[PDB]
Design a protein around this ligand. Sequence first.
Ligand SMILES: O=C(Nc1ccccc1)Nc1ccc(CCNc2ncnc3oc(-c4ccc(OCCN5CCC(O)CC5)cc4)cc23)cc1
Length: 255
Amino acid sequence: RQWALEDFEIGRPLGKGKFGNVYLAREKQSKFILALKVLFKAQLEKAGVEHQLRREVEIQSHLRHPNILRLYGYFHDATRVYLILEYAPLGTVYRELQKLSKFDEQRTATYITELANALSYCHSKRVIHRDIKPENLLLGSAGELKIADFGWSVHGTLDYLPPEMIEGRMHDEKVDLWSLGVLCYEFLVGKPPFEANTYQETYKRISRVEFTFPDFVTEGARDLISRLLKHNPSQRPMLREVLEHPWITANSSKP
Ligand SMILES: O=C(Nc1ccccc1)Nc1ccc(CCNc2ncnc3oc(-c4ccc(OCCN5CCC(O)CC5)cc4)cc23)cc1
């Protein structure tokens, strides 16, 4: 298993990333269909993030969960690093938001449950994501949600970052609960709650936790979102309490 690019047939582009492209691919020997993410050494090195990727690969390979995207392996050549990923045939939740605009409560609750289960397992293995956002949420063949990208895990737009990360503070696993809250809002409304036209204004609004709801967001959803988007990490609920929220249980199709 000392992989090389010549072991795969490369197919169509699945996405364009900051640091690299993702392509569909097929391993020649087995015909195993997978995704291949190609990052550039020169660009990671120059941005000082090459280590972060040593860490991701190290971390994501101790994780095994149906709502976390698998990293099967990795290799590299003169100038590029390749991640061999599980292929998620239904694409990103980002693209799904574009197509649909916003999701009903049942899709939203179902997705939060999947996320919360995934993050609970991560927290139990002492892992914090730090980078939950719809681009990094992939959909398996049955439409099951899959967390992608552990490039920023430990232990650009600001839209999904909590106050303690933008205000330059110590953070912990409650980072991921803020993220749930941002996503729960975005799913129901179709834009994240602190969205603005400038970095400076978005920063301001995250820092103050300044957001409002459209009249159509139901009271149960407002309750859950408000509990998650607390400025103080320690006032945010545990993952187990998110899963027990009556709005989540009333509306989720998964357990
Ligand atoms: O970059 C990372 N780390 C890192 C980077 C730099 C420095 C340090 C760390 N990590 C990282 C970041 C992101 C990823 C996810 C990459 N994208 C994908 N990965 C695996 N499978 C995938 O499948 C897709 C995909 C699959 C299908 C698809 O379209 C299918 C057909 N569509 C379905 C949707 C409908 O609206 C229209 C028709 C579109 C995309 C994307 C994808 C993986 C790893």
